[PDB]
Ligand binder design. Structure first.
Ligand SMILES: O=P(O)(O)Cc1ccccc1
Length: 232
């Protein structure tokens, strides 16, 4: 089934991980035009999420994921659930969000104490921690990049991402796993290196978004190897 994705950047591309994780699967995307990875930024596009879900339905999507973590967590857990209900009601399609994806990924891996490694400024990190706590997880510490650029996220390199995850875990080595948050990051080469070095799993925004959306679509598709314990 064709999977539709609402993505933060204006360009509206399918996030790059899809072709690596699931080369055989069809994805389509619609771009919100988010201007900054900040609460003020989210407020300027959040009301258009329902319309973009409908656009994707009109293009033949059979499920829709809102592929933005902070866009979906910044107002707390209830709003993540409510926005999902709104999308479903507007389209009659199964819908999900990237915040739901990462929650599901951490749960699937049995992660309760979670170290945070993020691209964000601290206001956004505080909101992430509050969301996770509402959902019965225990954030243990946090290291972050403090980036507000949207398209800028794709340019953070692998070595930077590995170092970020390692530093986050170093701060709390009793953690069960690591949440690497920001769906604009290109994390697929970082994940196996971090898991190799540390011995704990990483749940990363974009790959968890794909994993969750493919689960939602129901076909039982398996990801290509080398992308983390989440993919078996
Ligand atoms: O995962 P988040 O918090 O929505 C940030 C993001 C998502 C996609 C592209 C750029 C930035």
């Amino acid at each position: 089934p064709t999977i539709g994705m609402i993505v933060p950047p204006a360009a509206g591309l399918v996030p790059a991980d899809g072709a690596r994780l699931y080369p055989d699967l069809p994805f389509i995307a619609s771009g919100l035009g988010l201007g900054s990875v900040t609460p003020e930024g989210y407020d300027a596009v959040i009301e258009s999420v329902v319309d973009h879900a409908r656009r994707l339905q009109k293009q033949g999507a059979a499920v829709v994921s809102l592929m933005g973590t902070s866009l979906s967590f910044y107002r707390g857990a209830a709003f993540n659930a409510a926005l999902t209900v709104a999308m479903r009601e507007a389209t009659g399609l199964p819908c999900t969000t990237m915040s739901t994806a990462v929650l599901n990924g951490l749960r699937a891996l049995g992660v309760r104490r979670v170290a945070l490694a993020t691209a964000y400024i601290d206001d956004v990190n505080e909101r992430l921690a509050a969301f996770l706590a509402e959902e019965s997880l225990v954030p243990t510490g946090c290291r972050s990049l403090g980036i507000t650029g949207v398209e800028a996220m794709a340019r953070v390199d692998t070595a930077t991402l590995v170092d970020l995850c390692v530093r986050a875990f170093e701060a709390a080595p009793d953690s069960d796993g690591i949440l690497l948050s920001c769906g604009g990051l290109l994390t697929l080469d970082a994940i196996p290196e971090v898991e190799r070095r540390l011995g704990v799993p990483v749940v990363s925004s974009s790959p968890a978004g794909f994993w969750d959306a493919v689960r939602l679509a129901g076909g039982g598709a398996k990801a290509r190897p080398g992308y983390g314990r989440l993919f078996d």
